[PDB]
Structure 1
Amino acid sequence: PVDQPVHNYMVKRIHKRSLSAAFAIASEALSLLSNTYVDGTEIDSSLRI
């Protein structure tokens, strides 16, 4: 019987699954982010070490 030069095109649906990645600690930031080029003159050696 009948048989044709046939074709196949295409219409759609697709998925996804919400994020981040980890660690979490305390208040260093400001806790000594108050300085930055005057105060703290002498001896925080091992501090920045």
Structure 2
Amino acid sequence: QPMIARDGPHPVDQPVHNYMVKRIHKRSLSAAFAIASEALSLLSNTYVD
């Protein structure tokens, strides 16, 4: 931070350095996808059809 100069019977000020630490916050995303039983029976041929 900056600092100003003043006279008189005020205590003399010194500059102040500030240190700050933040941290992450974990979230997620979820979505679904379905396959019918007949499609699974059809796609599990592997060269018999």
> What TM bracket, shorter-length normalisation?
0.3 to 0.5
Using the size of structure 2 for normalisation, the TM-score is 0.40
Q: Calculate the TM-score normalised by the size of structure 1.
A: 0.40
Highest CA radius of gyration, 1 or 2?
2
